[PDB]
Design a protein around this ligand. Structure first.
Ligand SMILES: [Mg+2]
Ligand SMILES: [Mg+2]
Ligand SMILES: [Mg+2]
Ligand SMILES: [Mg+2]
Ligand SMILES: [Mg+2]
Ligand SMILES: [Mg+2]
Ligand SMILES: [Mg+2]
Ligand SMILES: [Mg+2]
Ligand SMILES: [Mg+2]
Ligand SMILES: [Mg+2]
Ligand SMILES: [Mg+2]
Ligand SMILES: [Mg+2]
Ligand SMILES: [Mg+2]
Ligand SMILES: [Mg+2]
Ligand SMILES: [Mg+2]
Ligand SMILES: [Mg+2]
Ligand SMILES: [Mg+2]
Ligand SMILES: [Mg+2]
Ligand SMILES: [Mg+2]
Ligand SMILES: [Mg+2]
Ligand SMILES: [Mg+2]
Ligand SMILES: [Mg+2]
Ligand SMILES: [Mg+2]
Ligand SMILES: [Mg+2]
Lengths: 45, 55, 146
RNA sequence: UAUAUUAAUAAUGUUAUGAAUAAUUAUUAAUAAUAAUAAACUAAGUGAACUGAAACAUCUAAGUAACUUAAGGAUAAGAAAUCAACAGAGAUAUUAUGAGUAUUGGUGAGAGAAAAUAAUAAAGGUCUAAUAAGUAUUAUGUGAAAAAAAUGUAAGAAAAUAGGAUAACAAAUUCUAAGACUAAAUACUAUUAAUAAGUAUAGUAAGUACCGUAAGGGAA
RNA sequence: AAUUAAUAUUAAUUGACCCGAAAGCAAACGAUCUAACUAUGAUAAGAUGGAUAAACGAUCGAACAGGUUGAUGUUGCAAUAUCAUCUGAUUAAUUGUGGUUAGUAGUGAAAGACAAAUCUGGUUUGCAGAUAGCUGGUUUUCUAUGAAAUAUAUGUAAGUA
RNA sequence: UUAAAUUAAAUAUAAAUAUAUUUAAGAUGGGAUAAUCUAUAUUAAUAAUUUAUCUUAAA
RNA sequence: AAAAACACCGCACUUUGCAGAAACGAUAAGUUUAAGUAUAAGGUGUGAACUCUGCUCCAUGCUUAAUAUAUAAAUAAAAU
RNA sequence: UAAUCUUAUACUUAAUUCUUAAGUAAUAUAUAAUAUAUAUAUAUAUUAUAUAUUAUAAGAGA
């Protein structure tokens, strides 16, 4: 039985999608800049 | 090329005897550039001459 | 020839100082290269390429079927004597450059040739080498006391 | 661990022998401190494909999108090794005409100059090179659908009594490569002022609610 | 007799009357689902048979893990469930926590199986108004005239001259 | 395992970057003592894969 | 769709002498192979064991040997 | 084979550390002279002059 694909764990989620993860890599930086340009309020977890 | 190999020389005064190459010290010879660069010139064993003031 | 991928490089013009938010810890040992370091074929920055770069063109068949290809310069790693430094200096060397060196009589001569073209077709490493050589020469000429 | 450490001193308590050693407080001196920084515009590197050709592979889209790098208030270009035609002009930039002409293309799809004359423009000329080779040139492989200038690989010149420019040669013209600087017209942003046969579903909310793990999408 | 402008028609190029693919390529995002590997932990009642007290991809059998057959369910309790039945159950076992590998592309005891409800190759942004000889749609009124479905050619026969 | 981090010239590469090597980070693991309760600081010197605990022997 | 399909233990063929072979690497350095070294490692078929595995290199490959034999780029100098 | 490639591992002076220059000592190599031993050749010792302080070893090798 599918449907329950997101299996929350705070550690994994901060480590993968978190602000610090984004800011550490060049690709991540691009993403953050993109979100800033769009004016998103929340740049990442 | 072959022609280039045959004919292209560089003029140098050797500052040391080189038995193998038959270039005795002090003498001014026209040698192949490879020879100059890879053997002679190392350790001030020779010196290029572009003109008579280089001598 | 043209030195289009050298003389087109531009570097942030320094503001002269009669402080900045971030100053470097070390001291600039070498003089700034006019044209800076190449961000194009960075393989070239390690040695003496004579302003030759990778070309990109088309492989073409008997059916005129285009397909991208690159062209590399004939680089050779080569330890060559420097009278002024009193040691052999090994570097990457386009064979053309080697030939030029041979013609001109020594690596020092090659480095220390005045023309702007020569300056252009040195790398940053080349520039550094030149600086070393000329400084050394100066030292030799002119001890502290006359 | 700058309510830092080191040094110097000053008051203080302890120990061993007025001098020596450690602890705390207080003054003076010395010694480092903190990349939040745009976006578009410009230049450069790499560089698709869908598509068009009523199929498709040459060609096309297109040196466009995209990614990457670097600079500046702008950037690039720029004072002829240029154009022209035996008469001449006189830096670039890009608008009218020239001209959809010359040129060119599986001579298909299609692509397409320059001279010249006008505008726009600013004072537009002016030395910062002891005047330029592995350079010009050649061979070969690439290279702005038309006009080269570039470039990988090897061969490789000449002194103004000389070079470059045209399939080729002969005349004749013209310019001087391998050294350089350059405002103005221009691009994009932001502000102000004006004009709207513009917008109230292009009239300020919100990049919020919400949707997705995420990039991302996205209301009323 | 031209030429210039306005107005109208037709024609070429640009998305060119409007809507609509499957696709291709570029750059990104995802391995909290899932696969394999990897590091570290944890679980496997009890009984039996073996040439060992302790050696077996051994036997019976709970937990755990499967998913054989049937019934129900099919806008369900549920975008795969329930009940019964059936299989493995010390291992090529199951499982927690973290990590690695994926978009010409990984993992795969291989089923084109899985890579976040499903892939003979994801998703998002862009090229982008791709292209569509195909389908559908194209909004007031009144007047005048009013066809064709034949021939020829066509990679042409749903088209076009 | 990860890290625009670290060796005229670490090595390689159109750019992006990739690589080995150091340094740092990284739990799911390891980490003194202690109810007859216990002191981690500063200075000076020179472990374990699994599994069984039988038989014998003694009293 | 749980099977007669994959895997398997075993059997066979083969490549590679380690500065290897295989794989990955706009391709490179370099990694896995392996702190391994032919009784190993990669690939391929078949698929425990028992009785067994006949005949055939025409063709497509591989593989060894030569001589037979053509051609591509790359050169002097010299002839119309 | 000093083509290419592979692998392993002291003082003095001048501008606390760094760099230059001079000489002297230390070690190595090359050349020259003298003394001794052996069969014109080889070995050892002494003296003079020159050069060096990326290396060494191993391997492939035009
Ligand atoms: Mg969901
Ligand atoms: Mg990751
Ligand atoms: Mg570009
Ligand atoms: Mg400028
Ligand atoms: Mg300029
Ligand atoms: Mg065009
Ligand atoms: Mg000039
Ligand atoms: Mg949600
Ligand atoms: Mg990713
Ligand atoms: Mg049991
Ligand atoms: Mg069992
Ligand atoms: Mg059974
Ligand atoms: Mg049972
Ligand atoms: Mg299953
Ligand atoms: Mg796991
Ligand atoms: Mg099938
Ligand atoms: Mg499977
Ligand atoms: Mg009628
Ligand atoms: Mg049709
Ligand atoms: Mg740590
Ligand atoms: Mg089933
Ligand atoms: Mg068998
Ligand atoms: Mg085998
Ligand atoms: Mg089979």
């Amino acid at each position: 039985s599918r449907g329950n694909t997101y299996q929350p764990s705070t550690l994994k989620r901060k480590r993968t999608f978190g602000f610090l993860a984004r800011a550490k890599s060049k690709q991540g930086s691009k993403i953050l800049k993109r979100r800033k340009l769009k004016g998103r309020w929340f740049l990442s977890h | 090329s072959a022609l280039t190999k045959r004919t292209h020389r560089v003029k140098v005064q050797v500052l040391k005897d080189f038995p193998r190459f038959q270039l005795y010290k002090g003498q001014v010879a026209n040698v192949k550039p490879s020879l100059m660069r890879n053997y002679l010139h190392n350790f001030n064993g020779a010196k290029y001459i572009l003109s008579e003031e280089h001598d | 020839r043209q030195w289009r991928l050298i003389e087109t490089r531009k570097i942030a013009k320094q503001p002269n100082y009669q402080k900045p938010l971030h100053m470097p810890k070390e001291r600039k040992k070498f003089p700034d290269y006019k044209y800076g370091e190449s961000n194009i074929f960075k393989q070239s920055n390690k040695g003496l390429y004579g302003g030759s770069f990778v070309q990109f063109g088309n492989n073409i068949s008997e059916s005129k079927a285009k397909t991208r290809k690159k062209w590399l310069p004939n680089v050779v790693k080569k330890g060559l004597w420097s009278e002024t430094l009193n040691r052999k200096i090994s570097i990457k060397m386009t064979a053309k450059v080697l030939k030029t060196i041979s013609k001109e009589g020594g690596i020092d001569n090659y480095l220390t040739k005045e023309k702007s073209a020569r300056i252009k077709e040195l790398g940053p490493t080349g520039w550094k080498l030149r600086y070393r050589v000329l400084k050394r020469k100066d030292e030799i000429e002119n001890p502290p006391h006359k």
